[PDB]
Amino acid sequence: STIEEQAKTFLDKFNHEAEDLFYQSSLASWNYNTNITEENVQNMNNAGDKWSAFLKEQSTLAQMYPLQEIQNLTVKLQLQALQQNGSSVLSEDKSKRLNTILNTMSTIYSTGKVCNPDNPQECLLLEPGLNEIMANSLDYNERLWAWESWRSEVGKQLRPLYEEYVVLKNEMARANHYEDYGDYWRGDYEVNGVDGYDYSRGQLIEDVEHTFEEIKPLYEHLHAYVRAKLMNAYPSYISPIGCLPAHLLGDMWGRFWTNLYSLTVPFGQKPNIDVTDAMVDQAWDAQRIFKEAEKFFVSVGLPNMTQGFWENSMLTDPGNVQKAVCHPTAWDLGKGDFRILMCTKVTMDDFLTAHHEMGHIQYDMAYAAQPFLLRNGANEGFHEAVGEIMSLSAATPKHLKSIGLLSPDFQEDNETEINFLLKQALTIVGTLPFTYMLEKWRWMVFKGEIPKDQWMKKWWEMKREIVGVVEPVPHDETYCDPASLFHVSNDYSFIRYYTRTLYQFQFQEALCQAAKHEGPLHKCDISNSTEAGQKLFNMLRLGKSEPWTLALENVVGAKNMNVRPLLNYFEPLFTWLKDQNKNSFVGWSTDWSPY
Template identity: 65%
Template sequence: MIIKFHWWNVTKYIYSSLEHVMANSEDYSERLHVWEGWRRETGKKMRPLYEDYVDLKNEASKLNGFKDYGAYWRYNYETIDEDPLYRYTGDELMADVRTIMPLYKELHAYVRARLMEVYKGDIDAEGPLPAHLLGDMWGRFWTNLYRLSIPYPDKPDIDVSKTMVDKGWTELQFFEEAEKFFMSVGLYEMFPNFWNNSMLTKPTDGRNVVCHPTAWDMGNREDFRIKMCTKVTMDDFLTVHHEMGHNQYQMAYRNLTYLLRDGANEGFHEAVGEIMSLSAATPKHLQSLGLLAPDFAYDEQTEINFLLKQALTIVATLPFTYMLEEWRWQVFEGNIPKDEWMKQWWEMKRELVGVAEPYPRDETYCDPPALFHVSGDYSFIRYFTRTIYQFQFQKALCDAANHTGALSTCDITNSKEAGTKLREMLELGRSQSWTKALHTISGDTRMDARPLLDYFQKLHDWLKADNAKHNRMVGWNPEISPYLKNQIKVRLSLKAALGDDAYPWNDNEMYLFKANVAYALRQYYAQWNISHSFTSEDVVTTPWTPRISFYLMVKNPETLNELIPKDVVVAAIRLSRARINDAFQLDDQTLEFEGIIPTLASPVKQPVEVWLVVFGVVMGIVVLLGAYLIFSGIRERKKKPAKATVENPYDETAEGQTNKAFEEGDDEQTGF
């Protein structure tokens, strides 16, 4: 299925056709078409707006006493307390990233290997993952990769989406079951306004709405709502628990003064929603709802399947979140200039996340605002901190519920003890620092990734063993591109060719180079009466090195999301090689296209003097004539009968005379 993009309808279809393609398609080109089209129709058009946004947000932040907008966001986590136990600075925020990366890299290696089986020839075994193959439009969650990477596919499916549909579950039923869960632990029944005023499914009256799930506190202590275009899937079932978790937090602190009606920090609010999802996702809870068979057995292989599914949602998103926010902070701080936004965005993505752009970018793009949270002015670090908090919360609540066994099997349903512990923390709202609120529920005063690592320990061990068994590289080489197979390396030797007359290589020369390559492509297709409007903008080059080398590739001007295959570009350059050389006063040795043999260049001839040619011809004739005479004489002698050889022809004695010519006679003759 190919979708034509138009700015006025792309938003309308993002939660239908486009989302469906990115969740389900296994067609590399179709996914690339959607991925690139979305960024061209959103990010590119938002580029000037986002540049203004950065300037204005920084200006407003400085007026409020912050050095930039990133510092303003980080202030949400800073605490000032006389007791150093509860004091916290924004510099501590990313301390847990390093502890999570070993688990992430093992997961990355496993997923890469499984995707290589689906997209044969399109993924390098040691390279980053192409960004458009990760299960959604942004590669934020890898949940939809589960069906492609399930370790033990013969085990019962723990993604119960199909069972929900088969059993006739409705969207409304999701919210009713979530409410039952909250009430079972002693939290709140939803207020009547929730059921009357929420938008729980996509309107069918033709209205265009933003479908991104959100929870709302209308500020009057009795009206709490959700806006969501719910679908009957397991993913949305868990999202409902998450969003209603926000509402539970809002209802818990509703009696505080208005300014204190908020989470202890933004990450707390997200974490509260997530701990509800952790219990709702367990096979035990799903079995209690009749979504897994009564005889369902939770054995070791099923546990690995479950943990992998959880990791694709939870672990895979952590480097994504960290890298996105780090890039924004650097942009707000001015450390990344505007003319390098995309360059450094994808360099960081490759280095930190192991994900690469599947199509060349330039500075006309602006990929980050293609994500709802970025264009919507949301701080994103909350999604990193919430993941750490949620497992600290979960461990504390499971301990309160007297859970025994692995943390991943804990379901706090019906535990009033766990609910009481949670409610005590929720009711604090923002009246206490988050370090004190965290201490209330878990006894900790700092973020700690150990509960998260404990939750996934069995999976981590399994991934290490499986990757080692199959000799997979753990990690990635950030220099490898998904489009590497279509790149051609170019080297120029201006000094060697022109000496002191060498001209400098600059942007103008690169423009001329691109124009020449575009000309070559036009000429190539013209052979078959095919008209392609190649321009210099279709020719993509990487930044050149000081010794003047760079990589070249060519976009397809007709589709705008495909690269011209390397073999076609090679053929076009060979066809116009002499014209390209002449444009730069170079030859095949000083303008080198790596891997392209100069078959169409004129033969190289050494200068030859004319007299040498004549002399050679004459000497050849003499030698041949001499040989002829020698061999013909030998042949004639062989034909005569054998007789005595006489050296002097006048020395004849047949008639008793030595030589008749000299007989004695009357006349004397004298000779000289």
């Protein structure tokens, strides 16, 4: 009779038909991903079309319920999620142009082929070849040619496209009652209406800044050490007082530094903790890898895997005749159906990745009871954080000696710990300034703080000032150097990686103090601790029903992002880096002294 009861009944109808149509859509997406055939393509397209049609009509019917007179938080959250007009708020011409722009950016990025001059008979694509050269080669001019050529071609062909893209997305956000597209992206972390746990869209930028200001000493020491080792690798091109050359970071863009373990190893004589050999000696098939992951999750207290998980998941590559997408993905079909699509091989990596994806599925299982539109992570960072904590705990020497992959007489000396922490630092601490810089550039270009004719000059300046990476040659506004990355060319939010990185170590400290760990944080394992599994499960079951600040308070006892667990995780490496940077100069200069 009142608006709130009408909203409850409408949400009940929506939840029922949403779960049915979503299940058909997800089953068709699964059938395309495990069987790439044209009838599966058209089935997936028809199911996706019927789902987007349903979510359109239902959003039209959902906007007749104003939110200011609904007092229940769950109903308010579901209606806030449903009433979003997305790209439909524009005119038909502008919406069609926006979808055309997005599609052509996707096709330029996916089919972008850049090759050597004077040899045009065949050319090299980004995904098969450019990642290899930019991640394995030790030649300066070869990496320079690939880097400059790809950014030159893709930037010249994508700069007017991005020029129209920023305007259309800004109009979309401002028609949707947001300040800019950056505010629209920051709206995922927004919490309104709960006392004490309130979080604003605008608070995220200063929280990220406040964490990064404490990230900066550790990153500076790591940068100095990496710089010194790269100076050993490249003798005259890199300056002691300057920044790193951009095409020497191990990736195409400098996003991850994990490709520099070979050049920047602390102790090359010591081996790593690779346990691939023990798996291949003991004949560990994919099934037993997932069974060991299941045993870990039942050891910590979480539920077993469902029968339909073992029956319906494709945990091995099917063969040559039947083609499937090889990307590791955890699927929440709904209707109690949870699957993992993983082309598992026998490696230490795939084992850790199986722990990661089963962490994703455990997160999806805990929140299943929740209503359909609240079956997600509390924010975009939690879902990957709860998988990365499992990848953290499973890779420890204690856990590997517990399950028999690592010998019981294995000596954990400090040198292999330094080696492990530096590999983890190159993967985790290395991506933080790049992520913060990229998101802050995107936020200012959406906000209009950066002028249109000053894009590259501002971007490179921030790369010199924040990341400590210098450009090889100056670039004018004919180039669109940010857009060479997959996430920015294809309209994806990027701050999730920064938030996930911080939430990962926060969750890890909370579970390790829950499980009574008496050593350094990097050695901690949450196996056989049911109080830690209970502590985590109290956040997993919530889903998106509660604020992400409340879920964070449920696990770590704090309601805001904290950087103290991350720096506490890398504390022995921080002391070691302080010890070996006595002769060298910590910090960088923004001058072009290397190049």
